[PDB]
Amino acid sequence: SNVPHKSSLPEGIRPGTVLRIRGLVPPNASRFHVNLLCGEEQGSDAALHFNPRLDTSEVVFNSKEQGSWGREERGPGVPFQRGQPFEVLIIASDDGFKAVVGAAQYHHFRHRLPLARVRLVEVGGDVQLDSVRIF
Amino acid sequence: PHKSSLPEGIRPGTVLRIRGLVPPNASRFHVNLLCGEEQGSDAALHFNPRLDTSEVVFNSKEQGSWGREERGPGVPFQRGQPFEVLIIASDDGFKAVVGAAQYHHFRHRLPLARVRLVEVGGDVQLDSVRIF
């Protein structure tokens, strides 16, 4: 019960910015998502779409440009489980986003959109959020 | 002292995660970003939580000479308590995160591409050190 979450970044983010998301996957959770959007308007571009799927045991990465999604990327397995807490670090570098789950590097999302367009992070879905901090 | 070699150097977007405990009679411990694995090498960042003097001292060392000391607001460390420290490399410096909030921004003094090693020493009981 702290979702949807919205953390506006009007000054944007750059290589070095760390997104720290902690929360709990509720018992009957299906899926939740973390989005890095380029605007507050609905249907805006998504520099990143981190999508853990508990029902299909997958973590999907994708982008959305001009109301059209790109090709989906998938990470190795699902480092999320129903009934367990998690910590996610989404780290912006010069050449992409590094996704860290549970003290280990999980997947490197190659940069598709210009990083300077990111203006907002949003977390939604079947997740009970503890904290969303941007360093 | 714990040593984590980095022949790869570090770039903007590298995150240092240190988890551990401050022992009961601890005085001070340090985290060093050194520019060579030899001894007396340059330090791009020195992070000295000093529980004895109730402060936290940042600094650099170039050719056997320390720079001007920087100090953070208070000491977010306690003896007998665990901690989590994030040292995040950006284009404009190192961000020190302690616990749940960012603690200090140490602006770059030495070139970040010269860093070759992370070192932790002093009165500290290390749990895990990870470079992301």
Closest listed residue to residue B105, CA positions, set B34, B39, B47, B37: B47
- DSSP states of B72-114: -SS----TT-EEEEEEEE-SSEEEEEETTEEEEEEE--S-GGG
Tell me if B116 sits within 8 A of B5, measured CB to CB. Answer: yes
Closest listed residue to residue B117, CA positions, set B50, B36, B61, B17: B36
Tell me if B21 sits within 8 A of B77, measured CB to CB. Answer: no
B17 touches chain A (CB under 8 A): yes
Identify the closest residue of chain B to A101 by CA–CA distance: B132
Resolution in A: 2.4
Query: In CATH, what is the architecture of B2-131?
Result: Sandwich (2.60)
CA distance A65 to A46: 7
Q: Which of A16, A103, A104 sits opposite B88 (nearest CB)?
A: A16
A contacts of B101 (beta carbons < 8 Å): 133
> A25 is written with which tokens?
């996957």
Half-sphere exposure of A67 (CA within 13 A, CB side): 3
B69 in a known ligand binding site: yes
- Whether B15 and A105 lie within 8 Å, measured CB to CB: no
Q: How was this structure determined?
A: X-ray
Pairing of strands A120-125, A32-37: antiparallel
**Distance to chain A for B106, nearest Cα, Å:** 14
A22 touches chain B (CB under 8 A): no
Q: Tell me the residue length of chain B.
A: 132
> A113 is written with which tokens?
């959109």
A contacts of B95 (beta carbons < 8 Å): 16, 18, 135
A11 touches chain B (CB under 8 A): no
Tell me if B54 sits within 8 A of B77, measured CB to CB. Answer: no
Please enumerate in sequence order all residues whose Cβ is within 8 A of that of B50, keeping only pairs 6 or more positions apart, or say none.
B27, B28, B56, B57, B75
A3 touches chain B (CB under 8 A): no
CA distance B60 to B114: 13
Q: Would you list the domain boundaries of chain A?
A: 5-134
First vs last C-alpha separation in chain A: 24
Buried b (16+ CB within 10 A) or exposed e, A95-112: ebbbbbbeeeebbbbebb
A118 touches chain B (CB under 8 A): no
Say which DSSP state A115 is in. G
B contacts of A103 (beta carbons < 8 Å): 17, 128, 130
Closest listed residue to residue B39, CA positions, set B57, B7, B61: B61
- Whether A15 and B12 lie within 8 Å, measured CB to CB: yes
- What is the Cα Rg of chain B in Å? 14
> A108 is written with which tokens?
């490197």
Q: B-contacting residues of A 66-95, CB under 8 Å?
A: 89, 91-94
For A5-134, the fitting CATH number among 3.40.50.720, 3.30.470.20, 2.60.120.200, 3.40.50.12280 is 2.60.120.200
> A98 is written with which tokens?
């590094």
CA distance B132 to B18: 11
B127 touches chain A (CB under 8 A): no
First vs last C-alpha separation in chain B: 20
